[PDB]
């Protein structure tokens, strides 16, 4: 199921969306390869993202409907920025 979790439509606040994006990494239990994930580490209290429903410690699987599973921290950052006015952030639990 690709489309199941509702995206967090965050409104533009001048430039920032009111949250901190962090490219976390969990090493794979087999090789030396790692598993990089894009998770929001913090959401400003009363910020746009907070209003949109974005929480910290989730897992951003898609940005604007685009698969970001594999991109660099900046690719997704730009992606979000490129949205314009608002951005749909597909958030899902961070279970590991």
């Amino acid at each position: 199921g690709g489309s199941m979790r509702p995206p967090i439509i965050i409104h533009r606040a001048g430039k920032k969306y009111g949250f901190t994006l962090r490219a976390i990494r969990v090493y794979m239990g087999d090789s030396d390869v790692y598993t990089v994930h894009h998770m929001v580490w913090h959401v400003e209290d009363g910020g746009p993202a907070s209003e949109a429903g974005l929480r910290q410690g989730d897992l951003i699987t898609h940005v604007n409907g685009e698969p970001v599973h594999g991109l660099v921290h900046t690719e997704v950052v730009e992606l979000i920025l490129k949205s314009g006015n608002k951005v749909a952030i597909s958030t899902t639990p961070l279970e590991n």
Partner: peptide
């Protein structure tokens, strides 16, 4: 820790 600052990047958007 996965919450490190080493390889774990951080940037406010």
């Amino acid at each position: 820790p996965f919450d490190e600052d080493q390889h774990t990047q951080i940037t406010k958007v």
